[PDB]
Amino acid sequence: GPVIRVAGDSTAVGEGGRWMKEMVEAWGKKTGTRVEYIDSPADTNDRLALYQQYWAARSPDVDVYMIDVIWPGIVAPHALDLKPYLTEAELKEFFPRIVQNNTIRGKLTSLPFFTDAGILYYRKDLLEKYGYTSPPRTWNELEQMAERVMEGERRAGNRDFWGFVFQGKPYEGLTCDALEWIYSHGGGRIVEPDGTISVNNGRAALALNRAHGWVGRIAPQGVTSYAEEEARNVWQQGNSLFMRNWPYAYALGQAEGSPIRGKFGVTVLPKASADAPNAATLGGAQLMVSAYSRYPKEAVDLVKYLASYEVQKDNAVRLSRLPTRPALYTDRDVLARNPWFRDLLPVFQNAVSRPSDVAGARYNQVSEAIWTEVHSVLTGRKKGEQAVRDLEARIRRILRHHHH
């Protein structure tokens, strides 16, 4: 019988790869279908380049791909339209915003699998130890808390201790972190939904200069090479007061044998001032059937199973990853395990998107521009003012003659 082959998630990032293979194998056992899991590199932009090799070749060697929320406009030609396979009632069980994101020129490229939003992780034990009752609401507060707690923990002999870790490596995760810095300073969305390239403004410049000012001071010098896992590893070992990361790090930090089990909470990221917007970059994964799959029916069945209530529930309970089904946010077992899913649901719903809708199939080029110009500020090569001017110019060239 057919062998259904899946590429999605990575064994290099938390438990995602391992869990994904387990789910695919469970489907295979349930249906009596042979399955194979193909592993992927950690970083989304590397995954995209890998999958593009299969797509360019029209390869039948992968039937199902896990695709990033930023990808439908790029990958649509390589996706089987799922719309004829789903009833309107079935589709309404997912958040409509994500179904819409995944629909490109009428083609439902992919089913919503898990969502994602950037959040602030904080050491509650250390806040209490140093006289703070709440996590920081403004970036200035975050800096002040980080300096005071670092001073004390260093003095007490933890030479590995930092105030803040985040994703500063030149890759897609930095575009996510930088959108949050820029938007939370009232500096806009980099490229607005209407197409306006707005990033050349003083608030965006200030956001980038602020981030530079962390490097080597409250954040390690090496933070300019950190992706999700590098940040998480410093944090999880007990060596950072604060971390910006995604939901998945919560379950990992709570696992038996984690140095920080029971010592942390999560909240919305800080912002420049009370009247700035909260920023949480929208992330997450969707499930695509390859246009080149020889087994569309079987692959659709697998995608439906993976996106089902009980599989998403398992993802939420065991891996603290966010459902794309609103009904799961009222599920007693989901909430007992992750009470913060309720507290932060409005943050998740109000997550700010990267400019993938407006950039469409040129999104990856736009994002590479963003992360390289932002990186040049983090490394000290450029100031924020020059970097946003140069970024404006780069994005104008990329998007010239593109309309949405």
List residues near ligand GLC by CB under 6 A.
44, 68-70, 116, 172-173, 176, 228, 246, 283-284
* Helix, strand, coil tally for the chain in percent (to 5): 50, 15, 35
Q: Is 27 or 246 the residue whose CB approaches ligand GLC more closely?
A: 246
Q: Are 50 and 40 in contact (CB under 8 A)?
A: yes
The C-alpha atoms of residue 242 and residue 26 are separated, in whole angstroms, by: 37
Instruction: Count Cα atoms within 13 angstroms, Cβ side, for 367.
Output: 27
Question: Between residues 14 and 186, which has the closer beta carbon with respect to ligand GLC?
Answer: 14
222 C-beta neighbours (distance < 10 Å), count: 15
The smaller minimum CB distance to ligand GLC, of residues 238 and 360, is found at: 360
Per DSSP, 59 falls in state -
Measured from the CB of residue 6, what is the shortest distance to ligand GLC in angstroms?
17
Closer to ligand GLC by Cβ: residue 184 or 281: 281
**Least distance from ligand GLC to the Cβ atom of residue 380, Å:** 23
Q: Least Å distance between CB 45 and ligand GLC? A: 8
Burial 152-190 (b: 16+ CB within 10 A, else e): ebeeeeeeebbbbbbbbbbbbbbbbbbbbbbbbbbbbbb
> What are 217's two structure tokens?
């001071």
Q: How many CB atoms lie within 10 A of CB 284?
A: 23
CB of 247 to ligand GLC, least distance (A): 9
φ, ψ dihedrals at 289, nearest 5°: -90, 130
Count of CB atoms situated within 10 Å of the CB of 280? 27
The answer to whether 374 and 215 have CB atoms below 8 angstroms apart is no
d(CA 213, CA 121): 20
Least distance to ligand GLC from the beta carbon of 167, Å? 6
Closest CB 385 distance from ligand GLC, rounded Å: 26
- For the residues of 127-195, what is the DSSP string, one character each? HHHTT--S--SBHHHHHHHHHHHHHHHHHTT-TT-EEEE---SSSHHHHHHHHHHHHHTT---SB-TTS
**Minimal distance, residue 39 CB to ligand GLC, in Å:** 15
Minimum Å gap between C-beta 371 and ligand GLC is 10
